[PDB]
Amino acid sequence: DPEVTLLLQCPGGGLPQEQIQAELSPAHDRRPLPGGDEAITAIWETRLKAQPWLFDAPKFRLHSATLAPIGSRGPQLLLRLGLTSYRDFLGTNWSSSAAWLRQQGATDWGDTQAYLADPLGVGAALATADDFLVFLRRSRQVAEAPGLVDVPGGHPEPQDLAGQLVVHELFSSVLQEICDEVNLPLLTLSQPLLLGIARNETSAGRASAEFYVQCSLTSEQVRKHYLSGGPEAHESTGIFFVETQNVRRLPETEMWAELCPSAKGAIILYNRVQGSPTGAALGSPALLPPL
Ligand SMILES: COC(=O)[C@@H]1C[C@@H](O)CN1C(=O)c1ccco1
């Protein structure tokens, strides 16, 4: 899977909101392009002159994420965040020249991402009361990953002493994206746990935070809620479910070639952090079948 890299695997089965610190700083922003940000402005002008209904929006930028020594007391993760935008994403990560920008960043800054917008995405491994994970089929008509399989998620928009409000918006945003796309009531969802962070190498290394969320509804009840919105209530074209038993070997299935990179990140981190038991009971051969 060359199109996905793990940047962070969380300890303890995943981190709750109260264990994460954020540092939101203009030191964590993208660097101006070598020949100037006029190249971004030109791409955006060309795009608006074909699709004038498009609009810009602010986004969080991932700079880096440092985990505490394992088993320690106190805050367990520091997220270093900057600010970026949809416009800056279209002019950098989505540019035909994105690989040239990665090489230039290595040369000038010793940082392949220095000249990239790198907006932070969120995604969920969303589990049902009857032990399935939730999958969504992407429209064949959109620009990114057309016709591929995804999990619930999105790219949160801004609004430890401004830090804690930023962590709150990240955790809030993954629940809001489940409510908006899957049409589930907020009170059927658990507080999220952060499983880790994955990078999409097909989008020049932009990162997504991947979360575990439990729903109190069965797969049949989740399907009813999704469908009862009608075609205008969701961006996806269909919903489906895979038993958690079978997610263990998903990379060996024909479904794997249909998953978009950020969804592959969610399922790798689910298998490493929530799956993969460490104790004698769940590690026994009748509960953890060999192969
Ligand atoms: C990195 O992902 C994105 O920027 C996606 C891509 C496209 O679907 C639009 N988009 C937004 O998030 C967006 C546009 C305006 C407000 O939000």
PDB file of C-alpha atoms and ligand atoms in Angstrom:
ATOM      1  CA  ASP A   1       0.000   0.000   0.000  1.00  0.00           C
ATOM      2  CA  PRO A   2       2.410   2.714  -1.224  1.00  0.00           C
ATOM      3  CA  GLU A   3      -0.477   5.245  -1.343  1.00  0.00           C
ATOM      4  CA  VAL A   4      -0.853   5.280   2.539  1.00  0.00           C
ATOM      5  CA  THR A   5       1.839   5.936   5.259  1.00  0.00           C
ATOM      6  CA  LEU A   6       1.198   5.887   9.076  1.00  0.00           C
ATOM      7  CA  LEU A   7       2.451   9.063  10.809  1.00  0.00           C
ATOM      8  CA  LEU A   8       1.080   8.154  14.337  1.00  0.00           C
ATOM      9  CA  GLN A   9      -0.274   4.952  16.028  1.00  0.00           C
ATOM     10  CA  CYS A  10      -1.949   5.836  19.399  1.00  0.00           C
ATOM     11  CA  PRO A  11      -1.388   3.777  22.555  1.00  0.00           C
ATOM     12  CA  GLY A  12      -3.920   2.355  25.053  1.00  0.00           C
ATOM     13  CA  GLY A  13      -6.478   1.343  22.377  1.00  0.00           C
ATOM     14  CA  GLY A  14      -6.778   5.056  21.321  1.00  0.00           C
ATOM     15  CA  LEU A  15      -6.682   8.494  23.024  1.00  0.00           C
ATOM     16  CA  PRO A  16      -9.654  10.442  24.425  1.00  0.00           C
ATOM     17  CA  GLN A  17     -10.045  14.228  23.929  1.00  0.00           C
ATOM     18  CA  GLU A  18      -8.816  15.011  27.535  1.00  0.00           C
ATOM     19  CA  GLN A  19      -5.357  13.448  26.787  1.00  0.00           C
ATOM     20  CA  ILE A  20      -4.489  15.636  23.718  1.00  0.00           C
ATOM     21  CA  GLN A  21      -2.856  19.104  23.551  1.00  0.00           C
ATOM     22  CA  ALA A  22      -2.782  21.327  20.404  1.00  0.00           C
ATOM     23  CA  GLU A  23      -0.313  24.166  19.580  1.00  0.00           C
ATOM     24  CA  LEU A  24      -1.958  26.383  16.844  1.00  0.00           C
ATOM     25  CA  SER A  25       0.859  28.722  15.621  1.00  0.00           C
ATOM     26  CA  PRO A  26       1.774  30.649  12.413  1.00  0.00           C
ATOM     27  CA  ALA A  27       5.215  28.866  12.766  1.00  0.00           C
ATOM     28  CA  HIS A  28       3.274  25.678  11.608  1.00  0.00           C
ATOM     29  CA  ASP A  29       1.960  27.341   8.375  1.00  0.00           C
ATOM     30  CA  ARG A  30       2.982  26.514   4.778  1.00  0.00           C
ATOM     31  CA  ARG A  31       6.092  28.456   3.560  1.00  0.00           C
ATOM     32  CA  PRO A  32       5.539  30.951   0.677  1.00  0.00           C
ATOM     33  CA  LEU A  33       6.321  29.278  -2.753  1.00  0.00           C
ATOM     34  CA  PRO A  34       9.857  29.945  -4.137  1.00  0.00           C
ATOM     35  CA  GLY A  35       8.634  32.135  -7.065  1.00  0.00           C
ATOM     36  CA  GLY A  36       5.760  33.529  -4.962  1.00  0.00           C
ATOM     37  CA  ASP A  37       2.139  32.613  -4.070  1.00  0.00           C
ATOM     38  CA  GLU A  38       0.979  34.293  -7.373  1.00  0.00           C
ATOM     39  CA  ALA A  39       1.026  30.701  -8.874  1.00  0.00           C
ATOM     40  CA  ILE A  40      -1.795  29.706  -6.372  1.00  0.00           C
ATOM     41  CA  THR A  41      -3.803  32.880  -7.181  1.00  0.00           C
ATOM     42  CA  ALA A  42      -3.533  32.082 -10.971  1.00  0.00           C
ATOM     43  CA  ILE A  43      -4.871  28.465 -10.568  1.00  0.00           C
ATOM     44  CA  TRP A  44      -7.784  29.792  -8.370  1.00  0.00           C
ATOM     45  CA  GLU A  45      -8.678  32.563 -10.920  1.00  0.00           C
ATOM     46  CA  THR A  46      -8.749  29.968 -13.777  1.00  0.00           C
ATOM     47  CA  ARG A  47     -11.010  27.706 -11.645  1.00  0.00           C
ATOM     48  CA  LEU A  48     -13.484  30.490 -10.588  1.00  0.00           C
ATOM     49  CA  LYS A  49     -13.769  31.678 -14.263  1.00  0.00           C
ATOM     50  CA  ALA A  50     -15.136  28.138 -15.150  1.00  0.00           C
ATOM     51  CA  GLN A  51     -17.067  27.470 -11.864  1.00  0.00           C
ATOM     52  CA  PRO A  52     -17.953  30.891 -10.316  1.00  0.00           C
ATOM     53  CA  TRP A  53     -20.213  29.267  -7.574  1.00  0.00           C
ATOM     54  CA  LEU A  54     -17.071  27.804  -5.842  1.00  0.00           C
ATOM     55  CA  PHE A  55     -15.995  29.357  -2.491  1.00  0.00           C
ATOM     56  CA  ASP A  56     -12.807  29.275  -0.366  1.00  0.00           C
ATOM     57  CA  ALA A  57     -12.816  28.071   3.300  1.00  0.00           C
ATOM     58  CA  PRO A  58     -10.145  27.984   6.050  1.00  0.00           C
ATOM     59  CA  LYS A  59      -8.714  24.564   7.109  1.00  0.00           C
ATOM     60  CA  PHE A  60      -6.328  23.291   9.849  1.00  0.00           C
ATOM     61  CA  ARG A  61      -2.781  22.417   8.586  1.00  0.00           C
ATOM     62  CA  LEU A  62      -0.915  19.417  10.162  1.00  0.00           C
ATOM     63  CA  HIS A  63       2.775  20.276  10.842  1.00  0.00           C
ATOM     64  CA  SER A  64       3.626  17.308  13.148  1.00  0.00           C
ATOM     65  CA  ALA A  65       2.341  15.155  16.086  1.00  0.00           C
ATOM     66  CA  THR A  66       4.617  14.080  19.053  1.00  0.00           C
ATOM     67  CA  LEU A  67       3.558  11.180  21.397  1.00  0.00           C
ATOM     68  CA  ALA A  68       4.643  11.206  25.092  1.00  0.00           C
ATOM     69  CA  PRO A  69       6.798   8.298  26.388  1.00  0.00           C
ATOM     70  CA  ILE A  70       4.374   5.270  26.657  1.00  0.00           C
ATOM     71  CA  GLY A  71       2.850   4.570  30.093  1.00  0.00           C
ATOM     72  CA  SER A  72       3.366   8.209  31.286  1.00  0.00           C
ATOM     73  CA  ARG A  73       0.893  10.330  33.328  1.00  0.00           C
ATOM     74  CA  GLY A  74      -0.350  13.660  31.954  1.00  0.00           C
ATOM     75  CA  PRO A  75      -0.994  14.731  28.313  1.00  0.00           C
ATOM     76  CA  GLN A  76      -0.150  11.940  25.837  1.00  0.00           C
ATOM     77  CA  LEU A  77      -0.029  13.783  22.449  1.00  0.00           C
ATOM     78  CA  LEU A  78       0.987  17.245  21.139  1.00  0.00           C
ATOM     79  CA  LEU A  79      -0.574  18.220  17.741  1.00  0.00           C
ATOM     80  CA  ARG A  80       1.350  21.081  16.045  1.00  0.00           C
ATOM     81  CA  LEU A  81      -1.197  22.864  13.794  1.00  0.00           C
ATOM     82  CA  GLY A  82      -1.179  25.850  11.403  1.00  0.00           C
ATOM     83  CA  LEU A  83      -3.853  27.378   9.147  1.00  0.00           C
ATOM     84  CA  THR A  84      -4.407  26.769   5.393  1.00  0.00           C
ATOM     85  CA  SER A  85      -7.362  26.925   2.931  1.00  0.00           C
ATOM     86  CA  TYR A  86      -9.204  25.072   0.140  1.00  0.00           C
ATOM     87  CA  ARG A  87      -7.619  27.576  -2.363  1.00  0.00           C
ATOM     88  CA  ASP A  88      -4.075  26.814  -1.122  1.00  0.00           C
ATOM     89  CA  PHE A  89      -4.851  23.031  -1.312  1.00  0.00           C
ATOM     90  CA  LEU A  90      -5.955  23.359  -5.008  1.00  0.00           C
ATOM     91  CA  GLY A  91      -2.738  25.321  -5.838  1.00  0.00           C
ATOM     92  CA  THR A  92      -0.280  22.920  -4.069  1.00  0.00           C
ATOM     93  CA  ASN A  93      -1.287  19.273  -3.143  1.00  0.00           C
ATOM     94  CA  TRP A  94      -3.809  19.069  -6.113  1.00  0.00           C
ATOM     95  CA  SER A  95      -1.374  20.853  -8.588  1.00  0.00           C
ATOM     96  CA  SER A  96       0.132  18.742 -11.431  1.00  0.00           C
ATOM     97  CA  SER A  97       3.535  20.035 -10.101  1.00  0.00           C
ATOM     98  CA  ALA A  98       2.981  18.802  -6.463  1.00  0.00           C
ATOM     99  CA  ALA A  99       5.996  16.357  -6.709  1.00  0.00           C
ATOM    100  CA  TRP A 100       8.257  19.307  -7.806  1.00  0.00           C
ATOM    101  CA  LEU A 101       7.098  21.272  -4.680  1.00  0.00           C
ATOM    102  CA  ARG A 102       7.971  18.228  -2.441  1.00  0.00           C
ATOM    103  CA  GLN A 103      11.545  18.048  -3.964  1.00  0.00           C
ATOM    104  CA  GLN A 104      11.979  21.875  -3.565  1.00  0.00           C
ATOM    105  CA  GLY A 105      10.853  21.672   0.100  1.00  0.00           C
ATOM    106  CA  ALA A 106      13.473  18.894   0.791  1.00  0.00           C
ATOM    107  CA  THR A 107      16.176  21.115  -0.864  1.00  0.00           C
ATOM    108  CA  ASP A 108      15.286  24.492   0.775  1.00  0.00           C
ATOM    109  CA  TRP A 109      13.870  23.464   4.254  1.00  0.00           C
ATOM    110  CA  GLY A 110      14.759  19.735   4.690  1.00  0.00           C
ATOM    111  CA  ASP A 111      10.954  19.172   4.750  1.00  0.00           C
ATOM    112  CA  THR A 112       9.085  17.521   1.803  1.00  0.00           C
ATOM    113  CA  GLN A 113       5.818  19.213   3.030  1.00  0.00           C
ATOM    114  CA  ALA A 114       7.174  22.840   3.534  1.00  0.00           C
ATOM    115  CA  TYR A 115       5.483  24.208   0.308  1.00  0.00           C
ATOM    116  CA  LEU A 116       2.240  22.072   0.655  1.00  0.00           C
ATOM    117  CA  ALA A 117      -1.112  23.239   2.142  1.00  0.00           C
ATOM    118  CA  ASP A 118      -1.594  19.781   3.879  1.00  0.00           C
ATOM    119  CA  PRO A 119      -5.161  20.404   5.227  1.00  0.00           C
ATOM    120  CA  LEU A 120      -6.012  18.009   8.141  1.00  0.00           C
ATOM    121  CA  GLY A 121      -8.858  15.538   7.390  1.00  0.00           C
ATOM    122  CA  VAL A 122     -10.908  13.466   9.887  1.00  0.00           C
ATOM    123  CA  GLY A 123     -12.297   9.908   9.319  1.00  0.00           C
ATOM    124  CA  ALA A 124     -14.035   7.261  11.464  1.00  0.00           C
ATOM    125  CA  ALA A 125     -14.063   3.511  11.912  1.00  0.00           C
ATOM    126  CA  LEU A 126     -17.766   3.574  12.923  1.00  0.00           C
ATOM    127  CA  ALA A 127     -18.920   0.281  14.617  1.00  0.00           C
ATOM    128  CA  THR A 128     -22.602  -0.861  15.010  1.00  0.00           C
ATOM    129  CA  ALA A 129     -24.199  -2.523  18.103  1.00  0.00           C
ATOM    130  CA  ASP A 130     -24.142  -5.883  16.103  1.00  0.00           C
ATOM    131  CA  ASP A 131     -20.339  -5.608  15.379  1.00  0.00           C
ATOM    132  CA  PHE A 132     -20.057  -4.268  11.782  1.00  0.00           C
ATOM    133  CA  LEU A 133     -18.034  -1.295  10.422  1.00  0.00           C
ATOM    134  CA  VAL A 134     -19.805   1.285   8.151  1.00  0.00           C
ATOM    135  CA  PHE A 135     -18.674   1.952   4.506  1.00  0.00           C
ATOM    136  CA  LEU A 136     -19.906   4.574   1.925  1.00  0.00           C
ATOM    137  CA  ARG A 137     -19.665   4.481  -1.936  1.00  0.00           C
ATOM    138  CA  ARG A 138     -18.336   7.708  -3.582  1.00  0.00           C
ATOM    139  CA  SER A 139     -20.149   9.226  -6.648  1.00  0.00           C
ATOM    140  CA  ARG A 140     -18.401   8.368 -10.020  1.00  0.00           C
ATOM    141  CA  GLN A 141     -18.831  12.122 -10.961  1.00  0.00           C
ATOM    142  CA  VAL A 142     -16.687  13.873  -8.220  1.00  0.00           C
ATOM    143  CA  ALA A 143     -13.021  14.968  -8.786  1.00  0.00           C
ATOM    144  CA  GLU A 144     -11.314  13.059  -5.887  1.00  0.00           C
ATOM    145  CA  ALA A 145     -11.326   9.211  -5.774  1.00  0.00           C
ATOM    146  CA  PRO A 146     -14.415   8.813  -8.045  1.00  0.00           C
ATOM    147  CA  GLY A 147     -16.443   5.630  -7.550  1.00  0.00           C
ATOM    148  CA  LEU A 148     -14.216   4.405  -4.653  1.00  0.00           C
ATOM    149  CA  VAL A 149     -15.224   3.118  -1.173  1.00  0.00           C
ATOM    150  CA  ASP A 150     -14.830   5.591   1.771  1.00  0.00           C
ATOM    151  CA  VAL A 151     -15.608   5.769   5.545  1.00  0.00           C
ATOM    152  CA  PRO A 152     -17.465   8.723   7.165  1.00  0.00           C
ATOM    153  CA  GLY A 153     -15.391  11.927   7.482  1.00  0.00           C
ATOM    154  CA  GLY A 154     -14.518  15.383   6.154  1.00  0.00           C
ATOM    155  CA  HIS A 155     -12.090  18.362   6.399  1.00  0.00           C
ATOM    156  CA  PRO A 156     -12.965  20.556   9.450  1.00  0.00           C
ATOM    157  CA  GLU A 157     -13.120  24.424   9.250  1.00  0.00           C
ATOM    158  CA  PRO A 158     -11.677  26.618  12.081  1.00  0.00           C
ATOM    159  CA  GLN A 159     -14.347  28.452  14.287  1.00  0.00           C
ATOM    160  CA  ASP A 160      -3.182  24.861  25.406  1.00  0.00           C
ATOM    161  CA  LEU A 161      -5.387  27.970  26.012  1.00  0.00           C
ATOM    162  CA  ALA A 162      -6.703  28.252  22.423  1.00  0.00           C
ATOM    163  CA  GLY A 163      -5.344  24.583  22.103  1.00  0.00           C
ATOM    164  CA  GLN A 164      -8.211  22.882  24.040  1.00  0.00           C
ATOM    165  CA  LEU A 165     -10.903  24.591  21.884  1.00  0.00           C
ATOM    166  CA  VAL A 166      -9.109  23.334  18.719  1.00  0.00           C
ATOM    167  CA  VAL A 167      -8.977  19.718  20.055  1.00  0.00           C
ATOM    168  CA  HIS A 168     -12.724  20.061  20.949  1.00  0.00           C
ATOM    169  CA  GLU A 169     -13.557  21.175  17.323  1.00  0.00           C
ATOM    170  CA  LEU A 170     -11.578  18.185  15.881  1.00  0.00           C
ATOM    171  CA  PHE A 171     -13.484  15.580  18.052  1.00  0.00           C
ATOM    172  CA  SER A 172     -16.833  17.467  17.480  1.00  0.00           C
ATOM    173  CA  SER A 173     -16.285  17.548  13.667  1.00  0.00           C
ATOM    174  CA  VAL A 174     -16.016  13.705  13.291  1.00  0.00           C
ATOM    175  CA  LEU A 175     -19.425  13.286  15.104  1.00  0.00           C
ATOM    176  CA  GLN A 176     -21.024  16.153  13.056  1.00  0.00           C
ATOM    177  CA  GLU A 177     -19.761  14.482   9.750  1.00  0.00           C
ATOM    178  CA  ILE A 178     -21.408  11.139  10.879  1.00  0.00           C
ATOM    179  CA  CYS A 179     -24.714  12.962  11.713  1.00  0.00           C
ATOM    180  CA  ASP A 180     -24.686  14.976   8.419  1.00  0.00           C
ATOM    181  CA  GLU A 181     -23.816  12.074   5.984  1.00  0.00           C
ATOM    182  CA  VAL A 182     -25.170   8.914   7.779  1.00  0.00           C
ATOM    183  CA  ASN A 183     -28.269  10.775   9.225  1.00  0.00           C
ATOM    184  CA  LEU A 184     -27.725   9.221  12.731  1.00  0.00           C
ATOM    185  CA  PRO A 185     -28.936  10.913  15.912  1.00  0.00           C
ATOM    186  CA  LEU A 186     -25.998  12.432  17.928  1.00  0.00           C
ATOM    187  CA  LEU A 187     -27.205  10.592  21.099  1.00  0.00           C
ATOM    188  CA  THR A 188     -26.590   7.138  19.455  1.00  0.00           C
ATOM    189  CA  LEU A 189     -22.776   7.949  19.191  1.00  0.00           C
ATOM    190  CA  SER A 190     -19.894   7.358  21.745  1.00  0.00           C
ATOM    191  CA  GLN A 191     -17.233  10.027  22.457  1.00  0.00           C
ATOM    192  CA  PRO A 192     -14.562   9.390  19.747  1.00  0.00           C
ATOM    193  CA  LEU A 193     -11.102   7.871  20.462  1.00  0.00           C
ATOM    194  CA  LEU A 194      -8.144   8.975  18.258  1.00  0.00           C
ATOM    195  CA  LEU A 195      -6.576   5.797  16.702  1.00  0.00           C
ATOM    196  CA  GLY A 196      -3.731   7.603  14.814  1.00  0.00           C
ATOM    197  CA  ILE A 197      -2.841   9.759  11.778  1.00  0.00           C
ATOM    198  CA  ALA A 198      -2.430   8.457   8.150  1.00  0.00           C
ATOM    199  CA  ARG A 199      -0.983  10.249   5.053  1.00  0.00           C
ATOM    200  CA  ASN A 200      -2.389  10.016   1.429  1.00  0.00           C
ATOM    201  CA  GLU A 201       0.720   9.832  -0.868  1.00  0.00           C
ATOM    202  CA  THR A 202      -1.616  10.146  -3.972  1.00  0.00           C
ATOM    203  CA  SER A 203      -2.501  13.668  -2.649  1.00  0.00           C
ATOM    204  CA  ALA A 204       1.209  14.711  -2.025  1.00  0.00           C
ATOM    205  CA  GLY A 205       1.153  13.503   1.633  1.00  0.00           C
ATOM    206  CA  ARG A 206      -1.902  15.313   3.110  1.00  0.00           C
ATOM    207  CA  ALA A 207      -2.842  13.736   6.486  1.00  0.00           C
ATOM    208  CA  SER A 208      -6.115  12.576   8.130  1.00  0.00           C
ATOM    209  CA  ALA A 209      -6.772  11.959  11.855  1.00  0.00           C
ATOM    210  CA  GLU A 210      -8.554   8.558  12.123  1.00  0.00           C
ATOM    211  CA  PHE A 211     -11.037   7.939  15.030  1.00  0.00           C
ATOM    212  CA  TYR A 212     -13.035   4.967  16.521  1.00  0.00           C
ATOM    213  CA  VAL A 213     -16.762   5.709  17.216  1.00  0.00           C
ATOM    214  CA  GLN A 214     -19.338   3.206  18.577  1.00  0.00           C
ATOM    215  CA  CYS A 215     -23.073   3.467  17.640  1.00  0.00           C
ATOM    216  CA  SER A 216     -25.877   2.008  19.850  1.00  0.00           C
ATOM    217  CA  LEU A 217     -27.932   1.121  16.668  1.00  0.00           C
ATOM    218  CA  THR A 218     -27.678  -2.168  14.692  1.00  0.00           C
ATOM    219  CA  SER A 219     -26.529  -2.282  10.991  1.00  0.00           C
ATOM    220  CA  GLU A 220     -30.269  -2.576   9.951  1.00  0.00           C
ATOM    221  CA  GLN A 221     -31.200   0.547  11.984  1.00  0.00           C
ATOM    222  CA  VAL A 222     -28.148   2.535  10.598  1.00  0.00           C
ATOM    223  CA  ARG A 223     -29.209   1.586   6.982  1.00  0.00           C
ATOM    224  CA  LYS A 224     -32.822   2.780   7.667  1.00  0.00           C
ATOM    225  CA  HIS A 225     -31.562   6.192   9.007  1.00  0.00           C
ATOM    226  CA  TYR A 226     -29.144   6.722   6.003  1.00  0.00           C
ATOM    227  CA  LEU A 227     -31.843   5.778   3.396  1.00  0.00           C
ATOM    228  CA  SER A 228     -34.717   7.759   5.062  1.00  0.00           C
ATOM    229  CA  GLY A 229     -32.838  11.019   4.245  1.00  0.00           C
ATOM    230  CA  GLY A 230     -33.339  10.384   0.492  1.00  0.00           C
ATOM    231  CA  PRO A 231     -30.752  11.035  -2.264  1.00  0.00           C
ATOM    232  CA  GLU A 232     -30.277  14.796  -1.358  1.00  0.00           C
ATOM    233  CA  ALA A 233     -29.439  14.024   2.344  1.00  0.00           C
ATOM    234  CA  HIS A 234     -26.007  12.409   1.480  1.00  0.00           C
ATOM    235  CA  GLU A 235     -23.019  13.051  -0.907  1.00  0.00           C
ATOM    236  CA  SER A 236     -22.331   9.242  -1.141  1.00  0.00           C
ATOM    237  CA  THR A 237     -24.438   6.953  -3.490  1.00  0.00           C
ATOM    238  CA  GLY A 238     -24.753   3.944  -1.124  1.00  0.00           C
ATOM    239  CA  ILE A 239     -24.015   2.452   2.371  1.00  0.00           C
ATOM    240  CA  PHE A 240     -22.817  -1.089   3.290  1.00  0.00           C
ATOM    241  CA  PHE A 241     -21.439  -3.053   6.310  1.00  0.00           C
ATOM    242  CA  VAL A 242     -18.538  -5.541   6.919  1.00  0.00           C
ATOM    243  CA  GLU A 243     -18.428  -7.696  10.102  1.00  0.00           C
ATOM    244  CA  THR A 244     -15.533  -6.642  12.445  1.00  0.00           C
ATOM    245  CA  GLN A 245     -14.538 -10.363  12.253  1.00  0.00           C
ATOM    246  CA  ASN A 246     -13.837  -9.900   8.465  1.00  0.00           C
ATOM    247  CA  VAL A 247     -12.138  -6.415   8.696  1.00  0.00           C
ATOM    248  CA  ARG A 248      -9.056  -8.280  10.081  1.00  0.00           C
ATOM    249  CA  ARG A 249      -8.314  -9.747   6.547  1.00  0.00           C
ATOM    250  CA  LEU A 250      -9.762  -6.879   4.414  1.00  0.00           C
ATOM    251  CA  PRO A 251      -6.304  -6.172   2.765  1.00  0.00           C
ATOM    252  CA  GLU A 252      -6.457  -9.737   1.248  1.00  0.00           C
ATOM    253  CA  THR A 253      -9.958  -9.112  -0.329  1.00  0.00           C
ATOM    254  CA  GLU A 254     -11.007  -7.619  -3.734  1.00  0.00           C
ATOM    255  CA  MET A 255     -12.625  -4.727  -1.701  1.00  0.00           C
ATOM    256  CA  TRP A 256      -9.076  -3.413  -0.810  1.00  0.00           C
ATOM    257  CA  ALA A 257      -8.372  -2.224  -4.428  1.00  0.00           C
ATOM    258  CA  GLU A 258     -11.646  -0.154  -4.291  1.00  0.00           C
ATOM    259  CA  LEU A 259     -10.859   1.687  -0.967  1.00  0.00           C
ATOM    260  CA  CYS A 260      -9.606   5.311  -1.180  1.00  0.00           C
ATOM    261  CA  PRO A 261      -6.286   5.987   0.636  1.00  0.00           C
ATOM    262  CA  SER A 262      -7.781   7.756   3.744  1.00  0.00           C
ATOM    263  CA  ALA A 263     -10.252   4.832   4.245  1.00  0.00           C
ATOM    264  CA  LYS A 264      -7.305   2.325   3.977  1.00  0.00           C
ATOM    265  CA  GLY A 265      -5.648   4.441   6.759  1.00  0.00           C
ATOM    266  CA  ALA A 266      -8.781   4.140   9.000  1.00  0.00           C
ATOM    267  CA  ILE A 267      -8.931   0.312   8.563  1.00  0.00           C
ATOM    268  CA  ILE A 268      -5.135  -0.276   9.110  1.00  0.00           C
ATOM    269  CA  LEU A 269      -5.287   1.814  12.350  1.00  0.00           C
ATOM    270  CA  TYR A 270      -8.574   0.060  13.491  1.00  0.00           C
ATOM    271  CA  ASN A 271      -6.873  -3.344  12.997  1.00  0.00           C
ATOM    272  CA  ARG A 272      -3.606  -2.297  14.841  1.00  0.00           C
ATOM    273  CA  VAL A 273      -5.153  -0.280  17.740  1.00  0.00           C
ATOM    274  CA  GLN A 274      -8.697  -1.736  18.481  1.00  0.00           C
ATOM    275  CA  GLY A 275      -8.054  -5.210  16.951  1.00  0.00           C
ATOM    276  CA  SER A 276      -4.717  -7.052  17.645  1.00  0.00           C
ATOM    277  CA  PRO A 277      -5.337  -8.161  21.300  1.00  0.00           C
ATOM    278  CA  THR A 278      -2.343  -8.255  23.796  1.00  0.00           C
ATOM    279  CA  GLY A 279      -3.825 -10.438  26.662  1.00  0.00           C
ATOM    280  CA  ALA A 280      -4.167 -14.244  27.269  1.00  0.00           C
ATOM    281  CA  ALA A 281      -8.034 -14.426  26.941  1.00  0.00           C
ATOM    282  CA  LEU A 282      -8.558 -12.570  23.568  1.00  0.00           C
ATOM    283  CA  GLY A 283      -5.163 -13.908  22.257  1.00  0.00           C
ATOM    284  CA  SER A 284      -6.249 -17.604  22.800  1.00  0.00           C
ATOM    285  CA  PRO A 285      -6.489 -19.536  19.440  1.00  0.00           C
ATOM    286  CA  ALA A 286     -10.322 -20.119  19.446  1.00  0.00           C
ATOM    287  CA  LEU A 287     -10.850 -16.264  19.796  1.00  0.00           C
ATOM    288  CA  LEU A 288      -7.801 -15.215  17.578  1.00  0.00           C
ATOM    289  CA  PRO A 289      -7.771 -17.803  14.770  1.00  0.00           C
ATOM    290  CA  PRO A 290      -4.245 -18.341  13.302  1.00  0.00           C
ATOM    291  CA  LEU A 291      -3.618 -16.957   9.711  1.00  0.00           C
TER     292      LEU A 291
HETATM  293  C1  LIG B   1      -8.961  18.746   1.163  1.00  0.00           C
HETATM  294  O1  LIG B   1     -10.394  18.627   0.963  1.00  0.00           O
HETATM  295  C2  LIG B   1     -11.041  19.722   0.590  1.00  0.00           C
HETATM  296  O2  LIG B   1     -10.637  20.835   0.763  1.00  0.00           O
HETATM  297  C3  LIG B   1     -12.364  19.368  -0.071  1.00  0.00           C
HETATM  298  C4  LIG B   1     -12.181  19.039  -1.558  1.00  0.00           C
HETATM  299  C5  LIG B   1     -13.513  19.430  -2.180  1.00  0.00           C
HETATM  300  O3  LIG B   1     -14.469  18.410  -1.950  1.00  0.00           O
HETATM  301  C6  LIG B   1     -13.903  20.687  -1.416  1.00  0.00           C
HETATM  302  N1  LIG B   1     -13.315  20.471  -0.088  1.00  0.00           N
HETATM  303  C7  LIG B   1     -13.606  21.177   1.030  1.00  0.00           C
HETATM  304  O4  LIG B   1     -13.271  20.670   2.107  1.00  0.00           O
HETATM  305  C8  LIG B   1     -14.212  22.439   1.029  1.00  0.00           C
HETATM  306  C9  LIG B   1     -14.413  23.382  -0.049  1.00  0.00           C
HETATM  307  C10 LIG B   1     -14.949  24.540   0.557  1.00  0.00           C
HETATM  308  C11 LIG B   1     -15.193  24.281   1.897  1.00  0.00           C
HETATM  309  O5  LIG B   1     -14.710  23.022   2.194  1.00  0.00           O
END
